[PDB]
Design an enzyme around this catalytic site. Structure first.
Site: not given
Ligand SMILES: [Ca+2]
Ligand SMILES: [Ca+2]
Ligand code: NI
Lengths: 419, 416
Positions: A128, A130, A135, A144, A201, A203, A235, A239, A242, A246, A255, A259, A352, A366
């Site tokens: 996968d 990114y 996204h 952040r 997600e 994709e 996908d 959340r 995850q 992660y 994940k 899928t 995504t 999102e």
């Protein structure tokens, strides 16, 4: 335009310009077999394999007898192009060979309504990427902040991770809300329970054709020779599971519970008429990732959600594959730069797909902006994340004049956790 | 005990009996075999000797080119196979010993056999369960105060690995090319990896899987663990460092991962089980188990460079230094419904004990290239040089016998 002797509705996903490859079975015959979609029918390739008299396929007809597309994918572009040209001729409204063979025609075609689709290939490794800038930026802002959205390496390499191959399922497969570990309260130990932030997600993914030898990188000039076709992918993501797991090794159980991919593999040849110039990249990538060949595609994508009590599905996302910052060529090249051996049937996903307009964000994380905004799903009903019974369907298509190259559905319904 | 001669220090006594895939000059077809003494017993040749309830209708699994189907049969089939093999190799069931025609076709020497990967690995997962290893890396990245990340003591952290690049012992490994960022104030550069490293690990193969959407309760986890092999998770540290945040190890790991050919059955390892390390905090109930499932397996790593006449042992460790057990790893891996399949490979992550002599990677042994490792003959190392060969070996020491794993070797080839 072009026409087949098989009637094709103007808005069908499967005109003679498409001709996707899939694996299907029927009530009459349980053996998974290779077929090509045309109109509302499926042409059984094993039944007509003897018609592939060309140089590239005459001694390789057995690949159309397999239960998966792997061997056909592994043959390479000469074989793909020959197969496509043969099919275009045979399905032509003016060609008599198949059209006028009443008995052959009878056992060569089956209604799509009668078919059960299976996974198109045995996926050895799923990766996968990114590559959607908005996204990564959106996730960055939530995590952040506005100032440190993208991480240092994003604009320099197509970041990606190894996904779980076993849990890639075909469209229509029910997906059970996953149990797992999460930490809702930072002042307390983690807890075990049902996922509370279940997400989808949007994709797209491409299948690898001939692979590369172990230790031998694929030059970007040859990358296109290894891309077979594309499918839609959802996908599914947990959340909360995850987020807790992660750091520092990456997405894992959040994940791998499921899928989904669409069954019909649209060949790259059918998508080339919709290629557009690649996005301008700044900073300019290192030489090994630089290519002039246009390889960005105008593919309209849509995602609908339908709750168990709803009679009409709500379109919650309208996006396009042309937004992607890193191309499939750069992704495949990067994936093999260290010598890693890609193999036929491998699946490389885009990550995504999110455009700049909020209407095109490819995940409910999102769209609901971390559960701070309600997603309108049709009066009296809203959503932040997925509820049990919700069905998510991803569709996509390229629009030509008087025809479209579609992908069929990439669907799945959420089942309650075992809790 | 066994009619086949077994040297006392042999890795393959009758108490071991590992499963593997081999081929020979006379027959290039990969087939299943069992190591005994310095020989290999061809299971496709003696498949008709498995006459028990669990295997009589499934002898075909011994005719396959991979062990997947056998692994997929489950514990009752594995236990019966082992018992049949032990009885045949002891003459208790004298068919194999006395049938000269069969016997001459059934055995071949290990020395002239070509070993292959034991199974078709659908998915490979690398855990990070060695506390000292995670701690050492944490100290190098974040500092002692923030050695372990918040989730480490709460769950068996791990990541999906690359299956395609898992190669059998003896396969040459090419130093990888890639992106690195040696200077944070300048753009990344493209070139040959400069910090090439090995990673001492052990891995287990999955037996019957679980259905998609159906977690494996920890109570049943032991029923899905087939056997173990040694592993060297080759790493390009400088490539890894630049790419890994936030999605995980990628190209810095996928250029190659080596495993030993012989799969030691869990039943052969049970006599060496030891108490499980005390976990504090205690894990959530779904990860709890009282059954001891930690093993005393002595591990050793040697390095021999170009121009060196002899290999130097750079690491002496033990599999007993694992905070999370294989049962907890398997359980955690399927807690969300993820479907483990026969042949899947779940690795331990770099194994490091508290003693510096037991650190499982050159990253640790040279402490990020700040300490020179003595490899003998007046030579030193921080990271791997082209031409260097790393060989990992392992064994359980019993009374008068030992259960060995053979070799997990690989030599570094210059970058292309
Ligand atoms: Ca994703
Ligand atoms: Ca590792
Ligand atoms: Ni025309």
């Amino acid at each position: 335009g072009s026409m087949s002797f098989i009637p094709v509705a103007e808005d069908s996903d499967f005109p003679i310009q498409n001709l996707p490859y899939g694996v299907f079975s029927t009530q009459s015959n349980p053996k998974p077999r290779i077929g090509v979609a045309i109109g509302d029918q499926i042409l059984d390739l094993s039944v007509i394999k003897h018609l592939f008299t060309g140089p590239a396929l005459s001694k390789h007809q057995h690949v159309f007898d397999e239960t998966t597309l792997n061997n056909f994918m592994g043959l390479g572009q000469a074989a793909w192009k020959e197969a496509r040209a043969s099919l275009q001729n045979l399905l032509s409204a003016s060609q008599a060979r198949l059209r006028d063979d009443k008995e052959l025609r009878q056992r060569a075609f089956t209604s799509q309504a009668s078919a059960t689709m299976h996974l198109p290939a045995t996926i050895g490794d799923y990766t996968d990427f990114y590559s959607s800038r908005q996204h990564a930026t959106n996730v960055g802002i939530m995590f952040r902040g506005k100032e440190n959205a993208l991480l240092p390496n994003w604009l320099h390499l197509p970041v990606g991770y190894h996904g779980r191959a076993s849990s890639i399922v075909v469209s229509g497969t029910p997906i059970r809300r996953p149990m797992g570990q999460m930490r809702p309260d930072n002042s307390k130990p983690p807890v075990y329970g049902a996922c509370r932030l279940l997400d989808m997600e949007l994709e797209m993914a491409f299948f690898v054709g001939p692979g590369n030898r172990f230790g031998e990188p694929i030059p970007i000039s040859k990358a296109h020779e290894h891309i077979f076709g594309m499918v839609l992918m959802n996908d599914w993501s947990a959340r909360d599971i995850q987020q807790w797991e992660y750091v520092p090794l990456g997405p894992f159980l959040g994940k791998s519970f499921g899928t989904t991919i669409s069954p019909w593999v649209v060949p790259m040849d059918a998508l080339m008429p919709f290629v557009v110039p690649n996005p301008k990249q700044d900073p300019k990538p290192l030489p090994y990732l630089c290519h002039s060949q246009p390889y960005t595609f105008d593919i309209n994508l849509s995602v609908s959600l339908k709750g168990e009590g709803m009679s009409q599905a709500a379109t919650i996302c309208r996006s396009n594959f042309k937004h992607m910052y890193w191309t499939m060529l750069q992704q495949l090249t990067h994936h093999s730069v260290n010598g890693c051996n890609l193999r036929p049937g491998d699946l490389l996903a885009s990550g995504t797909i999110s455009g700049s307009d909020p209407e095109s964000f490819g995940s409910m994380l999102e769209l609901s902006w971390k559960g701070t905004k309600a997603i309108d799903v049709g009066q009296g009903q809203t959503r932040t994340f997925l509820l049990d019974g919700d069905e998510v369907i991803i569709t996509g298509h390229c629009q030509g004049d008087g025809y479209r190259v579609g992908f069929g559905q990439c669907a799945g319904k959420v089942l309650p956790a075992l809790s």
